[PDB]
Design a binder for this molecule. Structure first.
Ligand SMILES: NC(=O)c1ccc[n+]([C@@H]2O[C@H](COP(=O)([O-])OP(=O)(O)OC[C@H]3O[C@@H](n4cnc5c(N)ncnc54)[C@H](OP(=O)(O)O)[C@@H]3O)[C@@H](O)[C@H]2O)c1
Ligand SMILES: CCCCC1C(=O)N(c2ccccc2)N(c2ccccc2)C1=O
Ligand SMILES: CCCCC1C(=O)N(c2ccccc2)N(c2ccccc2)C1=O
Ligand SMILES: CCCCC1C(=O)N(c2ccccc2)N(c2ccccc2)C1=O
Length: 348
């Protein structure tokens, strides 16, 4: 048997704690030499890190559709790989495949029925895009905007988490689908420049260093019609206060709250909820997995926009399975521009 590397959950940060690289531990394990009928042996190429993973580090995730990671057991998440051996009738050696529950391990034996075969032509061979802009975050942005944005209209969109995986795509799609103005809120001036100089955002606001309320008044002079919310907390309170009658909050995530012992989705404060109700602002829970029937058209559209040169795809790649923990910590504290990716093998 050959020896491979895996990542297991080492320790929990606590419900109110910050996640750190040391919450994960690398181990070496044997990979069995044979696979059974219906299984495939896959070489892991890229793995995702994602904000939802924070709740998987707690003993109770607080959400009925996410299971907690278990101490000393292999971690899992979005991944893409290449089939090395197959005893599944619909998969063969050399196929590229994806799973939402890919073990954090360099080579894996999986049930073939749990994988989706993907076409590398859709990403011009850049496979890591299947974990970002031509993957779940891209789909979340496109389907979120389509289903919850009510964009036809010379509307103004605000995007929080604007320079992240979802946000960087959302702001571009807002322009593609008819917003006249798209304004981004993010955590660094470097990110602000990216948004306006490369991604076509009309304005960018650094929430750490800028006065968010007054910058939104200057950059959104006609108020806010659509809010693509990745962050929640005080930032969302500030945006909501400038939202128009009959506007829409695309409630994508609330990452400002993930290191706190509070339920998801978190309620708005009494003052901000009052504004929401008075202005008839809609704020419905959005779960991209409720729209799996739209993933095909979504991916095909994201791909087409990419290939046309319209959709600009940004990512931050760290190399090596040993860096999964560091990549997660980095993403959670804003180290990533666009999608955080970990490259697990050589790009061939
Ligand atoms: N509803 C769904 O089906 C669905 C699907 C996918 C993702 N989501 C949600 O979408 C959001 C974005 O996920 P992603 O994968 O695109 O991650 P991401 O935006 O690429 O990475 C997270 C970013 O969050 C920002 N951040 C971290 N802590 C913050 C804080 N306290 N306040 C403000 N910003 C903070 C950081 O950028 P800064 O430098 O700008 O702080 C960091 O780069 C998350 O809330 C996630 O749960 C939802
Ligand atoms: C409690 C986290 C809040 C937003 C959250 C969500 O419900 N999903 C989410 C939806 C269904 C199953 C699992 C998570 N994911 C998510 C992350 C990456 C890709 C897709 C969805 C999210 O980040
Ligand atoms: C997308 C890859 C497979 C994920 C699959 C799943 O595990 N959950 C899921 C997780 C736990 C319990 C039930 C389903 N749901 C799901 C569907 C809609 C909304 C939320 C989750 C899914 O679609
Ligand atoms: C949450 C994942 C559950 C399976 C899921 C998948 O990963 N892809 C999928 C593959 C690559 C990127 C994003 C999703 N698609 C999918 C996409 C387009 C057409 C058919 C299927 C899927 O339905």
């Amino acid at each position: 048997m050959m020896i491979v590397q895996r990542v297991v959950l080492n320790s929990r940060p606590g419900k109110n704690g910050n996640p750190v690289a040391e919450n994960f531990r690398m181990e070496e394990v044997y990979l069995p030499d044979n696979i059974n009928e219906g299984q495939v042996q896959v070489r892991t190429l890229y793995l995702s890190v994602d904000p939802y993973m924070r709740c998987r580090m707690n003993e109770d995730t607080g959400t009925d559709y996410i299971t907690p990671w278990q101490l000393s057991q292999v971690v899992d998440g979005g991944g893409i790989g290449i089939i090395e051996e197959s005893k599944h009738t619909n998969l063969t050696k050399g196929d590229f495949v994806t799973s939402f529950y890919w073990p954090w391990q360099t080579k894996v034996i999986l049930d073939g029925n749990s994988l989706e075969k993907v076409d590398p032509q859709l990403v011009d061979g850049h496979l890591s895009y299947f974990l970002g802009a031509i993957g779940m975050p891209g789909l979340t942005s496109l389907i979120g905007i389509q289903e919850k944005g009510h964009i036809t209209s010379n509307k103004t969109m605000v995007v929080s988490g604007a320079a992240g995986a979802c946000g960087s795509v959302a702001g571009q799609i807002g322009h593609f689908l008819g917003c006249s103005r798209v304004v981004g809120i993010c955590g660094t001036h470097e990110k602000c420049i990216l948004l306006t100089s490369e991604l076509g955002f009309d304005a960018a606001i650094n929430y750490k260093k800028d006065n968010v309320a007054e910058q939104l008044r200057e950059s959104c002079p006609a108020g806010v019609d659509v809010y693509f919310d990745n962050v929640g907390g005080n930032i969302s309170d500030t945006v909501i206060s400038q939202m128009n009658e009959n506007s829409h909050i695309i409630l994508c995530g609330q990452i400002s709250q993930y290191n706190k012992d509070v339920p998801y989705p978190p309620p708005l404060s009494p003052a901000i909820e009052a504004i929401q109700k008075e202005r008839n602002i809609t704020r419905e829970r959005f779960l991209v997995l409720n729209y799996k029937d739209k993933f095909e058209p979504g991916i095909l559209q994201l791909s087409q926009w990419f290939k046309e040169g319209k959709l600009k795809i940004k990512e931050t790649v760290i190399n090596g399975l040993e860096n999964m923990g560091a990549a997660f910590q980095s993403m959670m504290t804003g180290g990533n521009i666009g999608k955080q990716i970990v490259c697990i093998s050589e790009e061939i």
